[PDB]
């Protein structure tokens, strides 16, 4: 049942921009999200001081997917463990305890990809979190589909738009509610020529060209959230990327870089079945 949203697909209602995404298959400058539009969205929350750490996604009732750098980044003396954090699923508002809508979960075990490269370029920026007990789904809480080789193959193409969401910075004010932006995937060439960081195959970049006129990007606080695409074949939402890194937020000539979830699916399978 992944990727079919209780309030949209299941009732045959389209959200207000998904057609831009479907028309293309030939947060800075985003908008406020509608209620129930990304029910897989998770907030990673620090207990003391109480604060937004990162975004994340619900992929099953037991498991959350996030960027490894949200948990361990030794340059900034960041190394969190299970009891440091709380996962808050079902939210829309950044700061309010949305009583009776959201669920807060405690973590059982964090798994960071063993070859996560924090030293040089955040290569394999991916971590899994097994929750203490299952979250029950609802109108506001529903998992996203992880892609298969064939959905990865036909959708992750230059020009095809995807959608990024998060409660991070609006500029390089944090928002009141969840923001959303739809960004085109960019050709690896262009991606490599915009930066000095060595790009690897476990990454892709998204954003409009300086001449395309539209603009938008992820920014600080958005890390760990989902880049998702809707399949035109079975109508579900698949998560293709994890918000990883950028050089500022929405600079011209620069693009955001995302962990390629399909390229690391084997490590994700291996951890889920060997641990629950």
């Amino acid at each position: 049942d992944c990727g079919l949203r209780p309030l949209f697909e299941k009732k045959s209602l389209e959200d207000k921009t998904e057609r831009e995404l479907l028309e293309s298959y030939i947060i800075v400058e985003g908008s406020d999200a509608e209620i129930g539009m990304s029910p897989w969205q998770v907030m990673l929350f620090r207990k003391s001081p109480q604060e937004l750490l990162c975004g994340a996604s619900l992929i099953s009732d037991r498991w959350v997917l996030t960027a490894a750098h949200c948990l361990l980044y030794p340059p900034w003396d960041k190394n969190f463990t299970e009891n440091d954090l709380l996962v808050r699923i079902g939210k829309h508002s950044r700061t309010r305890y949305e009583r009776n809508i959201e669920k807060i979960s405690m973590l059982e075990k964090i798994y960071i990809h063993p070859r996560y490269n924090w030293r040089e370029n955040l290569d394999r920026d991916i971590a899994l979190m097994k929750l203490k007990k299952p979250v029950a789904f609802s109108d506001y809480i529903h998992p996203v589909c992880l892609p298969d080789r064939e959905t990865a193959a036909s959708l992750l193409q230059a020009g095809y738009k995807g959608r990024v969401t998060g409660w991070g910075n609006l500029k390089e004010g944090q928002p009141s509610v969840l923001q959303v932006v739809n960004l085109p995937i960019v050709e690896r060439p262009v991606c490599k020529d915009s930066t000095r960081i060595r790009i690897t195959d476990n990454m892709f970049c998204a954003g409009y060209k300086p001449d395309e006129g539209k603009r938008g990007d992820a920014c600080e606080g958005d890390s760990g959230g989902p880049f998702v695409m809707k399949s035109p074949f079975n109508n579900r939402w698949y998560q293709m990327g994890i918000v990883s890194w950028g050089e500022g937020c929405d600079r011209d000539g620069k693009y955001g870089f995302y962990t390629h979830v399909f390229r690391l699916k084997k490590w994700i399978q291996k951890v889920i079945d060997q641990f629950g």
Partner: peptide, 11 residues
């Protein structure tokens, strides 16, 4: 500016 979450969770 986070609103105080229930202590039950913080325990």
């Amino acid at each position: 500016d986070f609103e105080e979450i229930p202590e039950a969770y913080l325990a």
